Design a protein around this ligand. Structure first.
Ligand SMILES: O=C(O)c1ccccc1NCC(O)[C@H](O)[C@H](O)COP(=O)(O)O
Length: 247
């Protein structure tokens, strides 16, 4: 990983020592990025609904993971499940129950710094994985990117600044997530996110991440060329909003 400080340094250490999970995979891979493109042509807003119990920024809600997912399944383009244990209260067991219950694409959200985590995602039933440019060096990113493709997955590469985008573009990323929240300081900056969305090649599927709570926000981001939206907090607090985001 890269030189890190604070909580990013801690969570990355927890991940280096994360035990692998052994299990048989039932269903074949369902591509999340190809499905976002088909929602685009059908002119249906593509929302990736996220399940997370806790968050360092203050979220804290109790809600059944299976019911929430079966519900989101009627409208969402895919699901994003947190598997990080200490800060998000996630677990590999939750991803597993979810994958056996629905049949739409699943993104595994964690801090992936080593190949065994991708084996974990595959064996658990996830369809793709998230790779964060700011915590990895260029070589590590390039290696983790190839490893995931060897399983037929196109991972979601997350950027937060221009330096991250230079790197993602160089290694040939085709599915990018622009995150408005800075992992290190927890600050949200919608402006910096808009500048970045505008610098991205039009042939890569773009996903806007963090701080979205209103439908006007989604409408604005869409005309800006964004293909999909990853929404966690607002949907966890009020599952019902999915109906408003979708009209
Ligand atoms: O989600 C958080 O609360 C959080 C807090 C500190 C550091 C990273 C975090 N998450 C980053 C992230 O990618 C989020 O899980 C999703 O993009 C959705 O953000 P949300 O919709 O909840 O604002």
């Amino acid at each position: 990983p890269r030189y890190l400080k604070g909580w990013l340094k801690d969570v990355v250490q927890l991940s280096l020592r994360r035990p692998s999970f052994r299990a048989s995979r039932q269903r074949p891979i369902i591509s999340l990025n190809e499905r976002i493109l088909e929602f685009n042509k059908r002119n249906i807003t593509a929302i990736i609904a996220e399940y997370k119990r806790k968050s360092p920024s203050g979220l804290d809600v109790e809600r059944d993971p299976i019911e929430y997912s079966k519900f989101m399944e009627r409208y969402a383009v895919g699901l994003s499940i947190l598997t990080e244990e200490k800060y998000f209260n996630g677990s590999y067991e939750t991803l597993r129950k979810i994958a056996s219950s629905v049949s739409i694409p699943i993104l595994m959200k964690d801090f992936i710094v080593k190949e065994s985590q991708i084996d974990d995602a595959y064996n658990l039933g996830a369809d793709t994985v998230l790779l964060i440019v700011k915590i990895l060096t260029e070589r590590e990113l390039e290696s983790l990117l190839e490893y995931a493709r060897s399983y037929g997955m196109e991972p979601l590469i997350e950027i937060n600044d221009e330096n991250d985008l230079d790197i993602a573009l160089r290694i040939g990323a085709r599915f990018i997530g622009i995150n408005s929240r800075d992992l290190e300081t927890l600050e949200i900056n919608k402006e910096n996110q808009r500048k970045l969305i505008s610098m991205i090649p039009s042939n890569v599927v773009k996903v806007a991440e963090s701080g979205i709570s209103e439908r006007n926000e989604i409408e604005e981001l869409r005309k800006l060329g964004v293909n999909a939206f990853l929404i966690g907090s607002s949907l966890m607090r009020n599952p019902e909003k999915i109906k408003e985001f979708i009209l």
